[PDB]
Structures are given as structure tokens and as C-alpha cells.
Amino acid sequence: MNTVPFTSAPIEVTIGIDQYSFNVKENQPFHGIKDIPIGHVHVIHFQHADNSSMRYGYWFDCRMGNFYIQYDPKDGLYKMMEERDGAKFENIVHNFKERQMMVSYPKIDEDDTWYNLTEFVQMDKIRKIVRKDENQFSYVDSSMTTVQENELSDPAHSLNYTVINFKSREAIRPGHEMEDFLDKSYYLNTVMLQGIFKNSSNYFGELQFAFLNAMFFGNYGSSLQWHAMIELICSSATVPKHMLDKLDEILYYQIKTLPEQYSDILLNERVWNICLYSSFQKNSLHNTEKIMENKYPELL
Amino acid sequence: GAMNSSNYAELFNNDIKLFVDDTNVYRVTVHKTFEGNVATKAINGCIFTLNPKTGHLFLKIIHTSVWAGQKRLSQLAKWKTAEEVSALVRSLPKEEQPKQIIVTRKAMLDPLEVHMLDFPNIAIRPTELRLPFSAAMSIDKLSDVVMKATEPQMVLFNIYDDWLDRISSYTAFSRLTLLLRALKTNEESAKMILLSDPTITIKSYHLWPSFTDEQWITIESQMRDLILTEYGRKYNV
Ligand SMILES: COC(=O)CN(C)C(=O)Cc1c(Cl)cccc1Cl
């Protein structure tokens, strides 16, 4: 079990740790988060009580270093930092635990939610979407735009998701205009899977990462990416059987985890009705279709 | 974006553009089978691609063989349309390619956009105008040529004949739409009006009779009365 200690909590903030969150009052004696499960990526995220503008946060993997949060009064945000001195770090974490100034990552043992949402997500790939290689963790926030959004402005702070565009020369083979536009199998399997992502896991990992950025930061371009990657699969007549089954699990846990009240803004009505009811894969997402119809039948 | 009443004059500026109408691409007769079921028999169609400024009608004849062995023909027709318009643009020299293509039905937007990805600088636009281009098969001649075709074939007509020698493209387009609206609302009457007078003939290279300016005014007035006539017959007004 790993720890993300905090130097302090100088400003009132809602702190998020994966799908959990808690309130920290201005200058409350808070020194971080303990018992974080090794083996998964994690995201620690923040919404200031005084300005819920800018949710922001850090994707990280405790196996990649010792990380702590420290408020920066100049830049005005909780910053993740790496401590290279491993002994200093252990000493700090031990003191804070002894004084019990840490909240415990509150994982229910029966609960595989976080694993199921991050199954295919790898820090290595996160660090390619979020380019800031001097750090081993990755900063995301609400307002970061995607490479594709900048096409239609600061490239250093972009989300470098894989550009999917159904009406693009990449998506459409000359001579198969109708075929490729109505059955996107070539684009999914040949261009994206074999060509860009190399395998389904890397595809699913970006899809999951897009969803999580959409959910935790209300990052709109992430939501566009999540929906595009779903639609590309659902609009392919030919998808490996294991990918469909896994897709259905992936989306099931994403829909299960989405706040009931945030559905209106994170769920694209057109994409979901198309995917569940019109697309080639309309009959292949049984779990997802069942949770969607019972939880968000309005949208449908 | 969309083409409507507000920007109606853009059609006649000097930016090359084409209207594309696909309403006569896929045409069928519906008949009873010996078993008493219903079947369709395709008949030749055409893509109506019109430069509203110059009067050029690039009339691509869609021979029924294009449908042979194909499923979902109403949907294929939009993609065939797109494929042919794209081929027409590619065949055209750069300085002749349209800057915009306006499709009369929105269902053509995605097919043509996809077929024209090689031409990102050609704007594909819908229109809110109800244009009567479906009646193009009522222009006597046009019905005759698309129905005699035995193979795919592109035919050129000036749909304005030599009118632009005497009127602007705005006025020519308005004459054309009024003629087509009339033919669409009551084809028998419309043709009666156009041909009542045997002394006025249709030139070999023309679609319409050689009316004098004064005779066009009379003709145009009679076509309005017809459209107004059918309007009352339809609505009992
Ligand atoms: C080379 O391919 C072409 O289609 C050349 N072209 C644009 C025309 O023939 C235009 C035209 C038409 Cl369609 C009808 C009457 C007169 C004229 Cl000029």
C-alpha cells in the first residue's frame, strides 16, 4: 500500500482520489492519503471551495516514484511533486501515519470498480497523451483542449488523444466511400487497431482515460474522444468478439460510475442511441444496454 | 452554411457553384407480381447538376444497370450521386471546379462530403429553398434522353437556352424555377401553355420554345396563374 502525503492544506478544497472524494477545510490538519492500492494508475484531483472553476488533478502510478502534494501559493494550486530522497519520504510518511493525519483510500474489498475503469490504462500511455516528460505524473484539468480541438491553442497543454474523424481521408479509402463510411471496420481494425494503437488494449486504455478525464474534470474534449472511440467500434460491422465483450464490460462500469446528475452533460444522446439501437453492435452490448435503459431511460 | 432567402443572390456571383439534385437518380415503377405481391422495376434516372450562373445542366444519366444486384437502393443512390458529382469535379480543370456544391436534399451532405474529401476547399452546403428540380424529367426533351439511354452517359444542355443573351442569371434562374414549379404542380397544363402556339418552336440545341421577351412575360404570367390555380384546386381556396 502506497501513500501520497500532503505538505499541508492551506486552502479549502474538495480532494478526489479515484472515484472517492472528501472535503478539506482551510488549514485543516490534513497530510494526505494512505493505503492507495499498488498496481493501478490513480488520479488525485482538486476543486477549490472558493472557485469550483478549474477542477484539476494528477494521474500517477505509485510504482513510478514517491509523490506528494504541496500547495503553491504563487500558482494557486495543489501541485504534485516527486521526492527523489526515498529515506526522507519514508520518514515523512511514517510521521504523518503515526499522527493519523491521513485519510485512507477507502476500498471495499468486494469492489473492483477502479480496476474495471482503469483496466487498460497505463501511465506510459497517459504520459504520451499528456506531454510533460520531466514529471512522472500527468496534470489534467477541466479546460485543457485536445489536439483535435485545436485543429478546429497552446500545444504544450493539449490532450494528445488519437485523432478520430469519420469524414477524413484516413477514415475513408478511395473507392470505398460508402462502404467505409457506413461500415467503419477498416478504420477501426486496420487504421486504428493495427496501424496506430497496435492492439485493443491500447485502444481501450485511451477510451477509459478519455472517459475518466471527462468524468473527473468535466473535460469536454475527453468526452468527445470517449464517445468517438465508442462510436467507431459500434459503427464497425467487423469487430473481434473479445473486443465487443470487453467493450460491454468497460462501458458498463463507466455508466455505473457516472454520477446520476451529470448524465445530461457527459452523455451524448446521439452516440448512445445510435450505438445501442442502430449500429452494427446494437445487440452486442447487453450489460451496457441494460444499465443504460434502467439508469438513463430519459436519454433514450 | 445553409442557403436560404437571405443569401439568394450568392447563386449568381462569380464564385463557381453547382446545385446537385438527386431526386431523379433512383426511379421505379411499382407493380403487382403474378403472385399478387408488389415489386419495383427501376427505370433510368439522372443526376441534375446545374450551374445557376451559366445555365450548365451536367445531366448524368443513371442507367438501371448500376442498381443490378445492389441492396438498399435509395441509400446507394445518394452515394452514387456523390460518386458521379465527385467524378464530374475531378474531370473538370481546376479553374472550372466549383467552389461550392449546394445539394437540394440534406441526405446528400454526408455522401458528397465523403466523396469530396480530396477537395477540402469545396464547400458542400444544404439549402432551405424548395427548388423544383425534380420536375427536370418533365422537360419533354430531358425525359426522352434519360429514357433512351442504354449505358451510363453524361449529357450537356443549357437549361437557360440563350436567355442570358437577353436577361441576367438571376432572372433566368427565376424563369427556370417558375417553369419547373409549374410543370411539377400540373405538368399537362404547363406543357399546354408552353406549346399552345405552334408558331413558336423549340430549337434543336434548346429545351424551351423561342419566346420573344414579350411572349416570356405572357408565358410567365400564365405559369403563375397555373401555380395559383392548382393551389386553389388543392386547398379548395
Ligand atoms: C469539359 O467538361 C465540360 O463539362 C466542359 N463544360 C464545363 C461544358 O460543356 C459546359 C457547357 C455545358 Cl455543360 C452546356 C452548354 C455549354 C457549356 Cl460550355
Q: Give the type of residue at A169.
A: R
The reply to whether B114 touches chain A by the CB within 8 Å rule is yes
- The best mutation among B49, B50, B57, B58 to test binding of ligand 1, ranked by most ligand atoms within 8 Å of the C-beta, falls on B58
Tell me which residue of B76, B20, B99 sits closest to A181, measured CA to CA: B76
Which technique was the structure solved with, according to the deposited record? X-ray
Domain positions in chain B: 9-163, 164-237
Residues of B in contact with A178 (CB under 8 A): 76, 79, 111, 114
Torsion of CA A241, A247, A249, A251, to 10 degrees: -160
Superfamily of domain B9-163 in CATH is Prp8 RNase H domain, palm region (3.30.420.230)
Cβ atoms of A36 and A2 closer than 8 Å:
yes
Which residue range forms the structural domain that includes residue A205? 116-296
Q: How far is the CA of B166 from the centre of ligand 1 (A)?
A: 20
What is the rounded CA–CA span in Å between residue A201 and residue A243? 9
Domain containing residue A174: CATH number: 1.25.40.550
**Contact (Cβ atoms closer than 8 angstroms) between residue A205 and residue A128:** no
Number of A:B CB contacts under 8 A?
23
Could you confirm whether domain B164-237 is CATH 3.30.460.80?
A: no
Angle at A82 between CA A77 and CA A87, to 5 degrees: 130
A177 with B83: Cβ contact below 8 A:
yes
- Nearest CA distance, A177 vs chain B (angstrom): 6
**Ligand 1 pocket by C-beta < 6 Å: which residues?**
B 56, 58, 96, 156, 158
Nearest CA in chain B to A167: B114
A142: CB partners within 8 A, 6+ apart: A53, A54, A55, A56, A217, A218, A219
In DSSP terms, B163 is beta-bridged to: none
* E strand residue ranges, B81-223: 100-103, 123-125, 153-158
The pairing of strands A77-83 and A20-24 is unpaired
Q: Compute the distance between CA of residue B228 and CA of residue A137 in angstroms, rounded to an integer.
A: 73
> To 5 degrees, how large is the angle CA A5–CA A18–CA A1?
50
Residue matched to cell numbers 429553398: B129
**What's the distance, Cα to Cα, between the start and end of chain A in Å?**
42
Resolution of this PDB entry, in A?
1.7
Our mutation pick for probing the ligand 1 site, out of B89, B155, B156, B203, counting the most ligand atoms within 8 A of Cβ, is B156
Q: H/E/C letters for each residue in A260-297?
A: HHHHHHHCCHHHHHHHHHHCCCCCCCHHHHHHHHHHCC
Q: How far off is chain B from A182, nearest CA to CA, in Å? A: 10
